[PDB]
Amino acid sequence: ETLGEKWKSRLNALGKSEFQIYKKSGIQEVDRTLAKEGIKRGETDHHAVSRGSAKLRWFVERNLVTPEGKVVDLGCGRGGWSYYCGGLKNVREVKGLTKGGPGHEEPIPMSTYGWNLVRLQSGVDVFFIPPERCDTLLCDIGESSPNPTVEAGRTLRVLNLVENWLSNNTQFCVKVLNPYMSSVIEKMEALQRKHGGALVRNPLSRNSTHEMYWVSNASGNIVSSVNMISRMLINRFTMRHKKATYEPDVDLGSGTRNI
Ligand SMILES: Nc1ncnc2c1ncn2[C@@H]1O[C@H](CSCC[C@H](N)C(=O)O)[C@@H](O)[C@H]1O
Ligand SMILES: Nc1nc2c(ncn2[C@@H]2O[C@H](COP(=O)(O)O)[C@@H](O)[C@H]2O)c(=O)[nH]1
């Protein structure tokens, strides 16, 4: 039984009030109030369709992932990672794909800076369409299940999925929902051998998720990197000063971009 499982159980043995408190004990947050209001108001400039923009930004401004050229955003959701990449210097084209439809986040049309370089389409199940060509491959797909083995299965489906989209020196940021389950650990070790990078924990993630992102421009022993998070999450179960620290949201400018 891996350390991460010991955690997942305690997580689950949590009560209504408890869980909610733990979910955010000492984590980083994005101040989205006004941005959400500007959007519900119909604004399409500056605002980020979600908090994923900020989340991606964290990896990007630390060169853990350097999006350039043709960017494919698997499970783009409302557009958070895509609209954000749409403003990055070296980016030429960004194509984001999602299931969408009733009961799922649907892409929000925006006019934020570089928007004209962004193609967003729902009604697409990435697990089956054929692989396209891409310089950078982003993927934030992975549904959380109270059942750790369910998550691991979902994570394996995602790994193999991106495995088919990764050519030789492609930039990537792939959400690895459950990296502690024996079996994902294995797959990851192989994936690392083939396409380098390492797993990295984003401070904007909630404690209720043991998610780590496989980012290209970073090294680190997989087993070692997954355990440092298992311990962190467990330490955070017992907190004093369980408050989150916020930070301003990302401003995505507005208007078109020329090449
Ligand atoms: N098999 C599949 N094919 C396509 N999209 C999928 C999928 N499984 C899940 N998704 C989508 O993946 C999304 C992940 S959450 C998206 C977060 C986004 N990067 C943000 O910044 O906006 C969900 O909105 C969901 O609809
Ligand atoms: N103990 C507890 N765990 C919860 C509760 N809600 C969600 N979780 C745990 O946290 C995981 C995903 O959290 P979520 O994105 O749904 O907040 C779930 O897979 C589950 O194991 C809750 O009320 N109590």
TrEMBL record:
Subcellular location field: Host cytoplasm, Host perinuclear region; Host endoplasmic reticulum membrane; Host mitochondrion; Host nucleus
Binding positions (S-adenosyl-L-methionine): S50, G80, W81, T98, K99, D125, V126, Y213
Domain MRNA cap 0-1 NS5-type MT: 1-258
Known function: Inhibits RNA silencing by interfering with host Dicer.
Assembly with partners or alone: Homodimer; in the endoplasmic reticulum and Golgi. Interacts with protein prM. Interacts with non-structural protein 1.
Entry protein name: Genome polyprotein
Organism from which the protein derives: Dengue virus type 2
Gene name tied to this protein: DENPoly
Complete-protein stretch covered: 2498 to 2756 of 3391
